[PDB]
């Protein structure tokens, strides 16, 4: 219970992002003081903000397991009528990468890219068999140390190991499938109404639905296709200038013989 | 403490597979009896498995978050000299949903797809701003109504709401961003030697690494443009046909005026 250093992971930097918990449904009545009552079972608080009459927070705790149990717990709990909603707030500094080679590791695409400014997170998204996909995601401490990364390795080649992959960093689109898209919020849609007239359902053939969707499934078949295709083409000519550049590389070493 | 179904959401199914966690570096001598005691505080267990000589096992707990809390109270604990791994195990009938309109919420994919069989979870991937992506995720509790949903989908014309939008179903691609693939595992590699030689850098220019990797960005550059004209010609098509079929459908109406 005194030791909360426990639920630290080996090489975990504290007060992260990845820390960071939203509280949503506060009662309007809520002070700073009590807010932090509420979370006084997970250690000391870092920063904390409160919107009273929005009726929302956020507060950093010590290390992610400590988050993790804290939204457990008190998700959905009552607080004067009202059941709190507790969730990890969005990483605001999370980058994409993509283009590495299948033994690049955490760790190195860590060491490469903490140039740029402090890491909190840097990982390799594998498959199901443990392969690298040949994408990554890295999160900084703070947005300028992401922008500086995206800058840097859009306007230079970054390399990581020797064989020269440039890495290729965009911005990391954040989505949201744990709360998606409930009832309660596409009711306030216009549509909607006149959209749950005619329930889930087969197509039955002979109807105006049935051409329409048929067509339409085709054209998404014929897309599918065009892209694979694109793939297709341009992985030929990748392969092509790996294998020019090598051979223009061998008749330069013959020529230091 | 004894009320343990209050950890339980609002309409949550218990025991589901996302309530299935995996636990890996288990001592070589571990019983069934004692990796049951190792989760005793956390309620009754649903499934149970042990492979004693490979030190792994799996447990289902009643809700999702009893495993997030027995998650991160036991993960990297030691056990008779070895730090414990747990992790959530990896849903095994899971779905892709797209093609979907902006108005279908999670209770209407939900309804939907009950009628191939019992569904854990279903929701509506949304954006940072809430609103809907098109795509979404379908959790059934055994592969079999997975199967069913995907073939079914495929060779038939779903429909979820008045307005014909055909769900194009697919088997979701299941990444792994925690783990990730860590130094220890890179290292088992043949070129992982040769290839940490060269440190991570920004390549200079006059060299056959800079001419190769600037090379392959511009053709990089171009597969994203093909990509990006490929999905306008294809929407193009694909807003004719919405008209098309709009027009054949008002000249039917006016047939029956």
Redesign the interface.
């Known amino acids: 219970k005194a030791n909360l250093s426990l ?1 630290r ?2 090489g975990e930097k504290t007060y992260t992002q990845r820390c960071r918990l939203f509280v949503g449904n506060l009662p309007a009545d809520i002070t700073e003081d009590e807010f932090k009552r509420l979370f006084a079972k997970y250690g000391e608080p870092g920063e904390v903000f409160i919107n009273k009459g929005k009726g929302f927070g956020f507060i950093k705790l010590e290390s992610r ?2 988050a ?2 804290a ?3 008190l ?2 709990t009552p607080m004067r009528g009202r059941q709190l909603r507790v969730r990890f707030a ?1 990483h605001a500094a999370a980058l994409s990468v993509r ?1 590495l ?8 695409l860590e ?2 890219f903490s ?1 740029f400014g402090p890491i909190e997170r840097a ?6 068999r ?1 392969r ?2 040949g994408k ?2 890295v999160e900084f401490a703070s947005k300028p140390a992401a922008r500086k990364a995206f800058e ?1 390795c859009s306007e ?11 890495v ?1 960093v965009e911005p990391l ?11 309660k ?2 009711q306030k ?1 216009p ?2 109404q ?5 329930p ?4 039955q053939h002979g109807t ?10 085709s ?2 078949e ?2 599918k296709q ?2 694979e295709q ?2 297709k ?2 992985k030929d ?2 392969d092509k ?2 294998s020019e ?1 090598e051979d ?2 061998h008749e ?1 070493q013959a020529n230091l013989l």
């Open positions: 639920l992971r080996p397991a400590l993790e149990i939204k457990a717990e998700d959905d969005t283009n080679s299948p033994y690049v590791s955490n760790e190195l060491e490469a140039q990982v390799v998204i594998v498959d199901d443990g690298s996909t990554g995601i840097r230079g080649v970054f390399l990581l190991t020797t064989t020269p992959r440039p290729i689109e954040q989505l949201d499938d744990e709360d998606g898209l409930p009832e919020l596409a849609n549509m909607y006149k959209e749950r007239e005619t889930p359902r087969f197509a105006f639905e049935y051409e329409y969707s048929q067509r339409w499934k054209l998404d014929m897309e065009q892209r694109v793939e083409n341009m000519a990748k200038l790996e550049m223009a590389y330069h």
